[PDB]
Amino acid sequence: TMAFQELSFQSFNGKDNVKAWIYTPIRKPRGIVQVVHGFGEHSRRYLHMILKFNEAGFVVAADDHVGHGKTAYDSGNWGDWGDKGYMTMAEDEHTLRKIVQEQYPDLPYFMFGHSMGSMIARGYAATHGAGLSGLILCGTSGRFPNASKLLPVLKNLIYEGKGQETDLSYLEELMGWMTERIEQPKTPNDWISSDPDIVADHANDPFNNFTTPPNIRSLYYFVQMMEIIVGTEWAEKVPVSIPIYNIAGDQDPVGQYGEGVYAVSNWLVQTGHHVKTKVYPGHRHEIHNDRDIRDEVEEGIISFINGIIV
Numbered sequence: 001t002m003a004f005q006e007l008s009f010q011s012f013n014g015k016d017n018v019k020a021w022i023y024t025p026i027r028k029p030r031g032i033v034q035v036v037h038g039f040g041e042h043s044r045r046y047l048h049m050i051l052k053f054n055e056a057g058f059v060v061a062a063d064d065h066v067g068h069g070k071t072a073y074d075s076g077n078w079g080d081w082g083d084k085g086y087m088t089m090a091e092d093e094h095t096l097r098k099i100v101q102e103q104y105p106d107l108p109y110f111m112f113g114h115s116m117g118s119m120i121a122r123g124y125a126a127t128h129g130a131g132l133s134g135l136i137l138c139g140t141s142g143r144f145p146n147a148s149k150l151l152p153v154l155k156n157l158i159y160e161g162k163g164q165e166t167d168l169s170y171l172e173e174l175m176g177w178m179t180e181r182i183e184q185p186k187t188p189n190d191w192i193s194s195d196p197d198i199v200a201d202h203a204n205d206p207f208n209n210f211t212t213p214p215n216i217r218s219l220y221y222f223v224q225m226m227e228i229i230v231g232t233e234w235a236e237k238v239p240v241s242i243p244i245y246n247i248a249g250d251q252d253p254v255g256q257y258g259e260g261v262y263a264v265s266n267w268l269v270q271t272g273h274h275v276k277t278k279v280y281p282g283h284r285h286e287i288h289n290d291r292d293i294r295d296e297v298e299e300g301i302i303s304f305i306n307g308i309i310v
């Protein structure tokens with residue numbers, strides 16, 4: 001029975017070695033939470049939350065996805081998620097799940113995802129959702145602006161053989177609008193948080209990446225992940241046995257400023273799911289890092305999980 005673990009497994013893409021960690025509670029384990037990070041960040045930003053989960057009695061598993069964090073640093077690959085399709089990241093989450101459940105086979109299992117991590121987790125719940133006791137979505141998207149238009153454009157560029165080329169202009173089309181509500185934004189990433197210190201730390205963390213853009217096929221995957229989880233057509237694929245906790249800030253462009261977050265909740269409720277939502281007024285994207293609400297955000301996640309375990 002191992003406690004803290006630092007591990008690696010081969011990616012579904014067949015080339016990257018995914019770096020991952022397992023963090024165990026000192027108390028008798030009561031559950032497992034798998035933490036799925038978002039675009040351009042990495043899993044060790046989540047240490048504060050992970051430790052809180054451990055103190056609640058939860059085992060925590062998290063990896064740095066392909067193209068991200070220590071996985072990207074050790075491989076030198078920041079821009080290419082590979083040639084195996086948009087399911088790659090969900091499949092790598094599945095590999096990590098099987099590792100941690102082999103160690104802890106009888107515990108209730110929960111998946112937490114923030115931003116692209118919530119997109120991965122939503123797709124995961126529709127493809128590998130059996131056995132999930134609960135799903136936590138943070139900073140999630142409704143219909144994400146420009147995603148549906150770029151999807152055929154990028155698909156064509158792949159068919160024309162340009163999938164491994166990099167064109168920053170498509171990423172700017174997809175994400176350049178996100179500071180639209182902010183007066184005099186000091187950086188294009190000010191939508192991350194209204195605390196400039198959080199934005200600056202994100203910029204200065206060498207395991208984050210907003211410097212090397214994804215290549216065309218990886219951007220295609222990203223927009224595929226955005227679009228495959230839209231609507232009741234997606235929500236019906238998620239077993240109603242999985243309760244959902246859906247949280248965001250209402251100044252977050254990723255979730256259309258609260259409206260897209262509640263649209264996701266509605267798609268799920270309309271298809272028979274048990275959903276609990278909390279939108280934090282006046283906060284941008286990273287509600288779980290904003291220091292004035294971080295403890296409340298974490299306690300809410302833990303309360304949701306505890307309500308399911310017993």
Ligand SMILES: [Cl-]
Nearest residue numbers: 008009010011
């Ligand atoms: Cl392996």
Ligand SMILES: [Cl-]
Nearest residue numbers: 025026027055
């Ligand atoms: Cl003690």
Ligand SMILES: [Cl-]
Nearest residue numbers: 048291294295
């Ligand atoms: Cl603290």
Ligand SMILES: [Cl-]
Nearest residue numbers: 104105106107
């Ligand atoms: Cl167990």
Ligand SMILES: [Cl-]
Nearest residue numbers: 142143144226
């Ligand atoms: Cl979308």
Ligand SMILES: [Cl-]
Nearest residue numbers: 158163164217
């Ligand atoms: Cl390609």
Ligand SMILES: [Cl-]
Nearest residue numbers: 186190196199
């Ligand atoms: Cl800032």
Ligand SMILES: [Cl-]
Nearest residue numbers: 231232263267
């Ligand atoms: Cl709709």
